[PDB]
Every structure is written in C-alpha cells, then in structure tokens.
Amino acid sequence: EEKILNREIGFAIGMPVCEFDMVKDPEVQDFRRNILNVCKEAVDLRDLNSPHSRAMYVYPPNVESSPELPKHIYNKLDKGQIIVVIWVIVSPNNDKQKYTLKINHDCVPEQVIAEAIRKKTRSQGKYILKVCGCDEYFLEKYPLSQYKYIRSCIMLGRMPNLMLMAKESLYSQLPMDCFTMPSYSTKSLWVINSALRIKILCATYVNIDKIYVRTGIYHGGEPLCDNVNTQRVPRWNEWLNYDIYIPDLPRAARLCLSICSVKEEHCPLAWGNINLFDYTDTLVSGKMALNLWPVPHGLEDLLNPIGVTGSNPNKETPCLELEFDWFSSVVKFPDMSVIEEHANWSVRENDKEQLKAISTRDPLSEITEQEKDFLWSHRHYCVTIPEILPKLLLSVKWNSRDEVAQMYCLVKDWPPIKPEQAMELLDCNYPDPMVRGFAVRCLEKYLTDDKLSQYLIQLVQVLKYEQYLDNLLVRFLLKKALTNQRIGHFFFWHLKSEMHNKTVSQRFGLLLESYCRACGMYLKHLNRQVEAMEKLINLTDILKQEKKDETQKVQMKFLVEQMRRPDFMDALQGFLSPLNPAHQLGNLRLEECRIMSSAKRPLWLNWENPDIMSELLFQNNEIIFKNGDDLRQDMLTLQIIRIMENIWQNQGLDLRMLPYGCLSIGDCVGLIEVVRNSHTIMQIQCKNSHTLHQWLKDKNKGEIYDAAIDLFTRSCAGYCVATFILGIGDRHNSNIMVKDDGQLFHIDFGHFLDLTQDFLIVISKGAQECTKTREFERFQEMCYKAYLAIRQHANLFINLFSMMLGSGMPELQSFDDIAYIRKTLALDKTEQEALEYFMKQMN
Ligand SMILES: Nc1ncc(-c2ccnc(N3CCOCC3)n2)cn1
C-alpha cells in the first residue's frame, strides 16, 4: 500500500520519509500538505485527454522554440523539402521495411505517416512516429523541422530514420495512474511606532581573547541600517537597538547574526540569519533558539547576509538564544489594500532619452546616486520602458515604507517582460516577494518547455534564495516537472545532486518527496538509476580508498570481479541513462569497460543500446563515470556553450560547437557523455606543426576534404571566441579534441573567468604563410562576427552567471568574478571600440 511507496520514495531521496514526519517545524508540515495541491493539478492535466495526455507527459515532443528555420539551415534543404526514411516492422521474423520520402520540411507527423502509408500500399491515424534507436516520439502536430532530431539531421546533412509504430503498442505500455493523497493530509506592522530592538540572551555550545555577537538588518545583501554589536565577553542578556523604525521594515527584511572573535584582529566563528517575518507574514516575537553554521571559506566580512536563512538542523552546534519584543498582539505585515492606501497618501523629451540610455545598461553597470534619484522621480514614465524594472527596483529605498508602498503599486500593474529579463529579478539581489512573484508570472506566461529545460540549472539554484518553503517559484517548477517527464528527470537529478549539502538538504528533500509522490511509475525508473549510481559510487570509492595504490591490471581484475557479482550485474543493466532518459542502457559490455589513467581515475563504461533499431543511431552507449571532480563548472560551461551556439545559429553564423552531456550525480560525482569517434590533439600528434592537418587529410579524402577543413575552421572559430569571452584556461593538447570529420571541441572546464600553429595550418589547407592566406582572413571575420553577436546578448550571460553566485563554486563567488566578462566583452566601450579591442587581442 503506502508503506511500499514510502520505502521507494526514501530510496530515491536517500532519506527515509519518516524523518520528515518527525520534524515539528510548522512551516515544514504546512509545506508537505499544501504542495499536494500542485501535485493534484498536474495529475489532473495528465488524465484530461487520457491516454494521449499520459503519453505526452512520459514522451514529450523534443522541439525547438520556433518553427522558423534560419536562412542557412533552409539552404541545406532541396527546394524546401527533406528526405526522410520511414521504417515499418512487419512481424513474424521482425522484418524491417524502409520507405524513403521527400516531403516539405514543415509537414506535420500525420502528413508524413499518410505519405508513408500511400508509398507502402502502392504495391489512417492509428499510428505514431518514433526516432529509430531511442525512446523519442513525434506525438504532436508540430512541423517536422521543429523537432530537434529532424532539425539536427538537416544541419550535419544526415538522414532522418523514423519508425512507424502502432498507437496501441505505445499506449498499452503506459502505466495506470493513482497519485493518491498521503496519510499526512492581529495588529498591523504600521501601527507599531517604535524602532527595532532585539535582545541577545546567551550562546551555548561555544567551546582567542574575547567573543561578541555582530548583528544587522538586511534586504538581500544590502543593509537597511548600521550593524550593532553586543559587548565583548557566554551570556550577554543585552537589548540591541537598531536605527530603523518597525513600520519602515520591508517584507523581506532579515536579521543577520554572527559570533566573532577578537590593530585588532576580527574573525567570524559561526553565522545565522533569521527572517524578521515568518511564512504567515507575522513579525517574529518572543524567545527563539538559533543554531549557527560554520563559516564558509573566503567570507571576507564578519556577516553572511546572502547565506541560508534558518536554524542549522544539527542542534549540537553554537546555539544563540534571542528575545524579540511582544506588542500584546500578533503583528502582521499589512494587506495589499492597506499598502495601496498608503501609496496613494504618499502623493521632458531630454529626460525620456536619458531614461532610454540608462535602460540599455547591463545588470552590473554602476548606477550613481543622482541616477537612482532620477529613475525614481520618473517611476511613472518607466512603466512605458518595461525593461527598466530591475534598474528602478535598485533605486527604491527599501528602508522607507513610503517608497516601498509606491513601488508595490507600480509592480502590481507592470507590463510583462521577456523571460530572460524576468530571470534577473530572481537572483539574490531581489528578495522582495512581490518582485519575485512578478518574475515568476512572466515565466509562467512566456517560458517554453524548451527554454525551461535549457535554464533548469539556474532555476533550481535560485530556489535556494526563496525566504519560505512554499513559494510561487517552487510551485511553478514542480508543476512543470510533474507535467513533462523530461523536465522532471533533470529536476530530480539537479535536486538529488545537492542532498549532501546540509544548508539545502531540508528544502530539497521536502521538494523531492512531493515530486516522487506525484511523478507516477517513473519513480521505479528513477530507483533503478539511483541503485546503479550507488553501486558505481561504492565501487569507485573502494578503488580510491582501499585498492588505491595497486596497479591498473590488479584494479581491473577487482573491477571485473566486483562487476560480475549478481547484485552488481543486476543493478548496472536495464536502466535509463541519467544523461538522457530517452536512451536505454542495456547489457554492460564489460570487455569494453576500462579504468582510465586520467586525473582521479574515471571509469569508461560501455552498454549496449537495446533498441530494436539501435544500428540506425548508435549500437553502444559509452559513458564516463567520475569520482572526485566537481562537475558543476563543466555543467555551467557546457550550458553557456550551447546558448552561444544558438545565438550564432539564429543570427545566420554557422559555428558548430559540441556541448556534450555532463550531469552531476552528487558530491563530486557524475557522468560525462563520450563523444564517439573523437581523439585528443596529443593522440593525433603521438601517432612538427603539420601533423594535425595530415591526419585530417588521410581521414577525409576527396570532396569530403573541403567539408572537414570548413567544419574545423567553423568549430575552431566558435571555440576561440567562447574560450576568450569566458576566460577558459588550461587549453593544452590533451583538453582539445577532434572528430573524424574535422570537428574540434574542448573538454574539462576546471578553469573559467580568470590558437596553436597546427590549427592555423589546418585552417589554411596546408599553406606555409598561413597567417596571410584568404582562408585566415575568412576565419578572422568569423571570429569578429561571433564576438559581436555574443556582445549583443551580454545581459543574458551576465544574468546566467549572476544566478550561479550562490552555488558555492570557487570560481564564481562574487560580482568581481562576473566582471571578467564585462572586460572581455568590453561592455564599457562602443561596438567599434570592442571589435578593435578583440582584434588587438587576436593579433
Ligand atoms: N570534468 C571532466 N570532463 C571531461 C573529462 C574527459 C576526460 C577524457 N575524455 C573525455 N571525453 C571523451 C570524449 O568525449 C568527450 C568527453 N572527457 C574529464 N573531466
């Protein structure tokens, strides 16, 4: 019954569900019950047009955001038509019959199926089209070229191989749903005319010269008043008085505490932050016990205002007891109507052009005090340039309820903005729940499932910035994960991979419980993925701890011996790939598995593809399992590279990049996708500057030589511009790879935000004066055009990095690290001045 489901949920999260039942925090138990509404809404969407809607949840169409094909992709077609191969399995003997078609690139799946039926019968709608070799279906009326698989075949010049499948054969393999409910289911702040005061009672569990408590009232990372310290001494029993009146406290105000140690040398020993208002909008009052957190490396200040809000779950840590005033009644933050009343009671063409100039500045551009006052005075004209909302929100004095009431009214009527601009309002700079709610509404209105999958790692990270467990953002993400299994799969893994981090364990564990309770039979597939990953984690841990010093041959004897055990073989075969759940990982080809001699000794694993038409895609799936490397920098880099490639493709610049798959599975463990038929530059050379070009010529003889040199040039141009803008380091010949067809790509992105002679000879087709050929001038023009196209999209890139500021990545800890892109992109210069800077760097 439910005891079975709770056991399976526990195995998926890596935490027994009864641990959440034991938590007495009312916010936790209210979240567990209230999130079930989102679960029921999603389950209802899945049964609305059953069984078609159930099939589209499990197998959502993998399409691009727009049906429009860029001019250079349309040119690859034959008079706007594509040649596709439709296969039909005609049992007995499982015989494969192919029928080749030449149809319009925008033909919907049913038109393609009808043309195949016509060609077959020359010797109605109870069929569906599947991609040969993987579990990807064409279940929706999109034009064929919009499907990522088809669009990928047009570019690349490959032939689409689709399979005509009986609609009944798919629907019968979909499970029967249940999603049954679990067993676990005043005065106004503005009338308190006193300044804020908080009593610091005593600190337990605090085993140099003296100790004191450092405190501050903050809104985001910005202090609303000066910091106040207790006396150096531990019992203080002292009331701390702040230079801020209670009615001027914004809704997202937080108390940031610290226990510091003392030409005096100061150092934080522990920190803790408390929301001044709880999840029910009640101002905190009475006694409270805050368990503090250890100081994170590289703090550079006495307080941590960006850090997680709430008491440390480990109650055997420094515990600071605090007392808040009680004003005889429960104090609440005023209703929207009350705020509206106070906002009302609070009240040139050269100026319109000055607002337009400020509006075009990037998120990290400095806005002077004169400019902040200028923007705020024209706050009413600003509703006509909606892209200026983030700049106007920074101009508001958040410690003044008169300005904040007026800002709330402007936000309540603000025109919707594009998702990439609404995402800037979801970083740590904008804590206000009305600002954050506006941003989420822009995402619900305009974010496609495609763009949501693309920006999933920033949206899962910005969940950590929410003040409360139940919020608009988490409800949006969970609804999208519970209505699109491809989004849900990555949503599950992005959360699970952070369960080891205790500052987020509770939030992410509760969110994972809701997801597992409502995802349906996919939980059984997720448990197989989790079980295979645990066997690999334990195995690689035994290798890196016990058999660490033994030889590679002795380690391989142990790996084969461990992997041949029944328990291990069953766990490592017949499960979906966490890198791409559309790929089934059948039988382990142990003869092809090897312990690599690369850093941290990763495992190169090879599994058969059990698809009946595996030969039309890939017969074997090769994945690297790594233990010891933080795959988060690689994830972020590969996401940026994919975004840069789309910016170039859509602007008509055909620069082909290779953002191979890379999923973090937990604490410094992950999977990396093996790009088939690839070799490092060092391998090509060790099997002189003219060696590389010679290897490419031996592999590509004839007309296919021109294609390989062109592809090499384009891919090389994209990676020179990308590595430049991002400041990617350690670009030696073992981190740069090349494919049989000339495609160049980089690997291992351990360094970010800080052209060999062999490539120039390949680009110039063999010439000795390579830097003087016309091919080098054409390659140089590609770089300049690629550089300027990305510079036009700088606000997107600055925002995608800014959302990663609180991930804990050593390379991105502050806005000074993101400022590296402001220098390479030369955002403080003109388009002509930036191109000349880039040209000087290239020359
Ligand atoms: N973090 C990180 N990322 C990638 C690697 C790595 C090392 C060796 N080979 C590959 N390749 C094989 C060819 O396909 C592309 C992936 N990757 C290592 N560490």
Structure description:
The structure is a monomer. By secondary structure, this protein is an alpha+beta fold. The protein has four domains: 187-332, C2 domain (Immunoglobulin-like), CATH 2.60.40; 336-522, Alpha Horseshoe (Serine Threonine Protein Phosphatase 5, Tetratricopeptide repeat); 523-649 and 665-666, Phosphatidylinositol 3-kinase Catalytic Subunit, Chain A, domain 4 (2-Layer Sandwich); 650-664 and 668-842, Phosphatidylinositol 3-kinase Catalytic Subunit, Chain A, Domain 5, CATH 1.10.1070. Helix content is 41%, strand content 17%. The strands form seven sheets. Strands 7, 8, 9, 11 and 12 form a five-stranded antiparallel sheet that branches. A five-stranded antiparallel sheet has the order 18-19-20-22-21, sandwiched between helices. A hairpin with a 7-residue loop joins strand 18 and strand 19. The longest helix is centred in the middle third of the chain and has 24 residues, at 522-545. The chain is globular. It starts with a helix and ends with a helix. 2-(morpholin-4-yl)[4,5'-bipyrimidin]-2'-amine binds next to loops. InterPro entries: ARM-type_fold, C2_domain_sf, Kinase-like_dom_sf, PI3/4_kinase_cat_dom, PI3/4_kinase_cat_sf, PI3/4_kinase_CS, PI3K-type_C2_dom, PI3K_ABD. Belongs to the PI3/PI4-kinase family.
